Design a protein around this ligand. Structure first.
Ligand SMILES: [Ca+2]
Ligand SMILES: [Ca+2]
Ligand SMILES: [Ca+2]
Ligand SMILES: [Ca+2]
Ligand SMILES: [Cl-]
Length: 323
């Protein structure tokens, strides 16, 4: 009775891959979904539910490894780690990939309606252009908004320099004539229905919007942006360790990573898989940006209570000025 309990985001695997996995290995899959970071964390932390594989965001890997909730991966049981691009490994949230392996990755950027703008935006500063009066929706998050302001000034999105942060808030005030609203998930409706020209959001969200409206495009500012990852981990409540490693190995096979990327539509970290994608997909710099753009990306740093609070307060200052 070999089995595997997987805990993943909803709509985040090609279901046919689960069927292939079971047929090929004999391992049955008990599939469980979550749809927010917080819901996942609560069920893992509670400790009473067995999960063998989970697919957390980089933010949650930072949080869970510090609470000793993840099993350090046994690389002697892992096959195909060489298939993951070096640019996706040894990141700040999991140095040495002690606990995790990339599943999908992406960026923060700009989704725009080609028919509603003249020249396409290309850099964070383009959002400040006079032509974009009441035309932009911003992702509702302090790190995202303060980060793009920082980047627009040539500063790191992880800055802990008070003067840099003061300059960033002053710069964001000048963007207010162009901001229609600050929203999170609901941004997609406004873009899909052609109700707003530009939105700042993440590449997975953008990918989903683009599927529903042929006039939308996505760009990652080449100068700097945010890098995100969803990753495979083995929670400490694991009961089927052999099965967990089998699944990791299955998902590292380029043909499986390829099929998954085609189904979900997000950027694969599997380099051999990328080479086998359709030309139009592989060559799209919206989702497979160039080497220099990659080099300029930064993962969000885990801030202590002080700096989390400082960024939160600064974003509230910005929201006050929008009133
Ligand atoms: Ca989903
Ligand atoms: Ca569920
Ligand atoms: Ca296959
Ligand atoms: Ca005002
Ligand atoms: Cl393969």
């Amino acid at each position: 009775s070999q089995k595997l309990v997987i805990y993943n985001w909803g709509d985040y695997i090609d279901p046919e891959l689960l069927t292939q996995f079971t047929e090929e290995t004999g391992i049955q899959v008990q599939y469980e979904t979550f749809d927010s970071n917080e819901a996942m964390y609560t069920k893992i932390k509670q400790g009473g539910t067995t999960y063998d594989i989970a697919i957390p965001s980089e933010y949650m890997i930072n949080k869970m490894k510090d609470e000793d909730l993840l099993v350090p991966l046994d690389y002697s049981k892992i096959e195909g780690i060489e298939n993951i691009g070096p640019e996706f490994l040894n990141q700040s949230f999991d140095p040495g990939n002690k606990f995790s392996i990339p599943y999908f990755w992406g960026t923060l950027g700009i989704v725009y309606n080609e028919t509603m703008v003249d020249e396409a935006p290309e850099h964070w500063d383009d959002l400040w252009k006079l032509e974009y009066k009441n035309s932009i929706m911003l992702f509702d998050g302090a790190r995202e908004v303060l980060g793009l302001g920082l980047n627009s000034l040539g500063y790191s999105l992880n800055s802990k320099d008070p003067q840099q942060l003061e300059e960033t808030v002053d710069k964001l005030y000048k963007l207010t004539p162009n901001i229609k609203a600050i929203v999170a998930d609901e941004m997609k409706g406004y873009m899909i229905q052609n109700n707003v020209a530009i939105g700042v959001t993440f590449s997975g969200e953008a990918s989903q919007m683009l599927e529903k409206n042929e006039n939308l495009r996505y760009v990652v500012p080449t100068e700097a942006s945010n890098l995100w990852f969803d990753n495979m981990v083995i929670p400490k409540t694991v009961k089927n360790q052999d099965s967990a490693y089998a699944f990791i190995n299955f998902m590292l096979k380029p043909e499986n990573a390829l099929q998954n990327a085609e189904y979900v539509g997000y950027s694969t970290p599997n380099l051999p898989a990328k080479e086998l994608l359709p030309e139009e997909t592989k060559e799209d710099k919206a989702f497979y940006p160039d080497v220099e753009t990659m080099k300029h990306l930064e993962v969000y740093e885990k801030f202590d209570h002080k700096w989390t609070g400082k960024y939160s307060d600064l974003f509230l200052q910005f929201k006050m000025y929008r009133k």
